[PDB]
Amino acid sequence: HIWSDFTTRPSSLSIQSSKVKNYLFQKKASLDPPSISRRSNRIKYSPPEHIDEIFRMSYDFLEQRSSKFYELANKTKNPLKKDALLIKAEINNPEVQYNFQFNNKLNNVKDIIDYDVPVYRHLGKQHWESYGQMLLMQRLETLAAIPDTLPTLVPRAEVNIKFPFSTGVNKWIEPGEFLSSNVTSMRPIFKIQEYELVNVEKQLYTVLIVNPDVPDLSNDSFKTALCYGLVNINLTYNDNLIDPRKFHSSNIIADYLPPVPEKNAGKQRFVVWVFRQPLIEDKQGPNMLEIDRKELSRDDFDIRQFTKKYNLTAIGAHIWRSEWDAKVAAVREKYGLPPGRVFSRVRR
Amino acid sequence: TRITLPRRPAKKIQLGKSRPAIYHQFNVKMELSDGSVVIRRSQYPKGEIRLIQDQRNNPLWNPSRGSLDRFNKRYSSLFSTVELSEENKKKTQ
Amino acid sequence: PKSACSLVKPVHHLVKIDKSKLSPRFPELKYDKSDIRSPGFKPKDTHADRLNDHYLNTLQSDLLLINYSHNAAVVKGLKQRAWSGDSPYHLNRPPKNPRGSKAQLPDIHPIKWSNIPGLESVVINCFVREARENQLLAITAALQLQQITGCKPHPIFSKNDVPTWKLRKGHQMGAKVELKGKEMSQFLSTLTEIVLPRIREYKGISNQSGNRFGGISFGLTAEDIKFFPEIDANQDSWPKTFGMHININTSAQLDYQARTLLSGFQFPFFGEEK
Amino acid sequence: SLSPLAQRVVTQLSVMSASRKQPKLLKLAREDLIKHQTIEKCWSIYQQQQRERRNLQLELQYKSIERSMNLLQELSPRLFEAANASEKGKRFPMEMKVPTDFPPNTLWHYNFR
Amino acid sequence: PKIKVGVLLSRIPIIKSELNELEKKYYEYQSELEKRLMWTFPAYFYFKKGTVAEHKFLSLQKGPISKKNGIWFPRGIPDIKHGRERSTKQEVKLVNRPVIPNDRITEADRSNDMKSLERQLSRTLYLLVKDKSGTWKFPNFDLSDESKPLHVHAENELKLLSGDQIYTWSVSATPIGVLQDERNRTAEFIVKSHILAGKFDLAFEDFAWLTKGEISEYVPKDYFNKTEFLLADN
RNA sequence: AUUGAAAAAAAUAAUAUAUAUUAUAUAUAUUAAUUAUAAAUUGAAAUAUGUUUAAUUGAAUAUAUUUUAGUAAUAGAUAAAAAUAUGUACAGUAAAAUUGUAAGGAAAACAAUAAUAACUUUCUC
Structure with missing residues (x-):
């Protein structure tokens, strides 16, 4: 009985609720489901017949399978293979399924869904692929944030942004949203959730928010603008919210300048990109990198060139898009930016 | 001229809400010609049927192994083979 | 409409966007029909299928043994022939249609452990021709079919027009x-045991019957349908009764293999084979 | 309004129709739902295993046949030829019936023809 | 090398295979799920109103509890259509003789008679034979003539052994496998064939009809390994 | 909430209530419904109140109050039978010819008829 053992196995694989666990594992269908909170509703409810004995048999079967997998898993040396074996062992565990399905994945509590555990991480990845990743990809393609900034994306990390400091309200930004200048007045907060097996201690990350749609009247086209640039950030599967708490002033290659779209300049895409650092062998600890702060410019910014220079690989992305409103002038004034231009309504 | 049942407005089955037609079926025991019983699910309400003419008593399915009745009844005293031999001269045809 | 010009734009990523999942319109429809949460849920594997079990145990191995031909290679079917490039008019020319046929024919593979012939599907086509006069006859036929099978019938409509008929x-x-x-299997078992023996001068299925590739068929008269136990048990309820065609579809490469398979399930075969 | 024949047709139609004959939807609790999932998944796995076992067995049989036929070809050509014939019209014997649920009165026939 | 003819006679099962403990329970659950989801029995069709047959059916049945005003129904209010609680599973209780099926276990099975053909009805029995020595094996025959085909020769040999009690059917002319060895420079080509209707009963001392699980016990280990896959598990 | 059975909570989504913000957000509670809709001196069922049989429950029967039966097709995002011919969103592929099959025949309907290298997941030697 491998799934009842918790000597070597993490605590997160168990259900933390006692009542639920008891309901799952009983000898007869006597008890009533903890999910149904109300007495009358519990009374009304009737579970399907014979479900218990069969369930128990299924558990035994899959428990045996897990145990067999574990016999292989411990003998394995290479890490990715071992992780895969672990996943195979525990993915069919009812308790872990319960944990994952019916508790929040975004702000996961460590005791319930631990992303340090490989199985839970795999589940989270699968969930991301099912909806959120596809949506992100659609928003990147439709809005034309990929070819315009950075050729392609192979989504690996789930990136979610927030604007807590400006207004007060709590809301994770859906990709391709129209945010007010009040909302995006102060800086955002990232959460880079990584689902691949990666060296947590060594692996650093960079985060770049880029505005491809600021108008350049000499060229009669647009230019990029690095609105916010962080480097050498340390992520951990559970500890992953990039906040002023975590990153230091040394990490900020270009400190947050807010979206201030001009009147009739149009809708401006702000597409955050998340890259992981190149990992160097034969060097213990996190390998930093120095950025030439005079070389990179904010008013015009070759993202692709920058990536080429520092050998980055874009793992994640997110995007919002701002256009002119009444408060952009106020935002500019607060930041000490100039009055802000006004263009002709007609694109002649 | 054409005999029909004229249609009423159709009931809108919404997408996702369509349910599969699980007809009411009883477990029915068929005893064949011999005593071999077989269970089959059936819509007609009859728990047990016993069959007279099956594959298990048909010569095609096992080669290795009431006018007539009325006639037999009312010509029984005579007992009607020997009778065939008696009444079968094959000269005239 | 400003235009009718259809033209799908290329993309800049290899992620496969399932558009259905991004909507919030049909939440019940996002679940698979196999899933318990779907209204489309039906218990599939309700009991042990008997004919299927028999096939698995006895027949399949026997069939494999029968169909072994030593060092048998693939027999390619009739395909669309390309033109020899002996003229510059061959250069964007569509390929010549197949030799005998207009449509292409499939390759016949050697039978191995993977591709042993087996039952794929049964189809019971009942087209009642008196229903050109009476629509109610079609309904009765459909009911009869349902009774026989334990499966939901689909209505046939007249696809063509003709004056003579x-x-x-x-x-x-x-x-x-x-x-x-499993329902199909049951229906076959009933046919073998109950119905076809009660047909009087029944020699069997013809050996000249069938597709060229793994499909065999035959038909039952209105007289033959009254032997089905669901119809037989209430002869008062069934005054009229309709014949039917029975298309058996196998996973057989050729038709003789399909015939052999059907014989394994106690179907008699009488005529001179092709 | 309607004839007796029309009525009977309507009744027949109703027998087939889902109109006012079907129950409520099968709702489950989350724990119950999980239990169901675990039952189904395990079953599916078991079925797959069984399929592989049977498939493997068939493959093994095929290999054995191949081994036999090569040997036969090597040794006795006539015997090999006899073995490797077209069995086009081969018919399973009508005595090899599909096993019933319960057995007959006379289990086995000792005499024949 | 000497050509020899192996023969294994396969008596096929005459009834359904016995369900596994896991399987049975699962099937019961699926049946109960079906019942829960099943439609109402349309009794109005199968039983005509104002008839003697209907009345008996009605008597057999018990009706559902209807909703009635001014009463608490703590299991929800009754949802009824065609006289069925929609919220629950429906149960419908139903020469003139009761169909009584025969016992699947037999007299032979009870006694453990290995020579009998009626001893296992749900399994595939295989004819085994014991030679002059203590070993068991599938019937071997010397093919000296080599004029006739191999499977036909095997069948003839079996018939000779029987004294024309046996009635066999060769599945094919192709041999299923070979048993070969270096000590005796021979080659036993194994044919497959099916006992249809007859005794065996009889150089060989003793015989038996056994399943795949019992053959392992009887026969040697190497021999079993050679010829395991040829035999059906059920 | 009362009723049955033998401290709590940690998703999505929906519903109810509240408030945050020149942000259709968050918090707490709960998981309803899901193929229905008026009109039935006649069928069927339940419950309540009586009476008789073997304090008791079953069984039978009377009245009252209800509930069911109006029996009608699509069950699938349906896909070349016929039907809403303009919008939008999602998805799919036709035809002919050939081989067959109960009446069926040149001509009614149904079935079948090009290739899987590589890739992902699952089980397995």
């Missing part, structure tokens, strides 16, 4: 039902 276009006329898996 008093037939309109778009008129409900009989019904069909594709049986698959």
